[PDB]
């Protein structure tokens, strides 16, 4: 059919879905970041969700 057959399945999909979700109130709200690197630093060190 032409659709890709090497695609994430199971745990990969769960991880990608859990990562790209939002909740109304969390650690960090409307905060402004200069780029994705600051986002990763904020998440990993625990100052943001």
């Amino acid at each position: 059919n032409g659709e890709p057959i090497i695609v994430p399945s199971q745990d990969v999909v769960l991880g990608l879905y859990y990562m790209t979700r939002d909740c109304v109130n969390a650690k960090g709200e409307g905060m402004v970041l200069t780029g994705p690197k600051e986002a990763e630093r904020l998440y990993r060190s625990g100052l943001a969700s």
Binding site: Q10, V13, Y17, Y18, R21, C23, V24, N25, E29
Partner: protein, 147 residues
């Protein structure tokens, strides 16, 4: 505890039982033959199954009610089973319906459909009779997949 059974399941089951008792007495009056009452009982049980599944999805979809800086709002639930079903990682609405909502009307002794369905999900137990009913369908499915 991740499989939240809807709170109104016993109420809808009670309404279904009352209606089937009413149709039973109406048949006993003699104005309805076996075919019409059989079709009607299948129809009402299927409608009850649909409404039970809808109620369970309603309670499971936005189960979270998390407050914000002002008042409180309602947003998509982080329930692990719904998180699995919605993400498409594993499972679908039918299997969640089996897990939390009623197992549903099912039968395959020869393709026919039995009057009374399995009203108990997998979170609650299944009686001996209901398990013996589910075995017919499971056996037919396994044999068909093998052959």
């Amino acid at each position: 505890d991740d499989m939240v059974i809807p709170e109104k399941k016993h109420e809808i089951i009670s309404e279904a039982e009352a209606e089937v008792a009413e149709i039973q007495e109406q048949f006993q009056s003699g104005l309805v033959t076996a075919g019409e009452r059989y079709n009607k009982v299948i129809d009402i049980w299927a409608a009850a199954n649909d409404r039970v599944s809808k109620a369970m999805m309603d309670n499971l979809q936005t189960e979270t009610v998390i407050n914000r800086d002002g008042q409180e709002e309602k947003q998509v639930s982080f329930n692990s089973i719904y998180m699995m079903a919605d993400s498409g990682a594993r499972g679908s609405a039918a299997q969640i319906r089996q897990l939390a909502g009623m197992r549903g009307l099912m039968a395959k002794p020869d393709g026919s459909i039995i009057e009374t369905p399995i009203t108990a999900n997998f979170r609650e137990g299944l009686n001996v009779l209901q398990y013996f009913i589910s075995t017919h369908g499971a056996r037919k499915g396994l044999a068909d997949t093998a052959l």
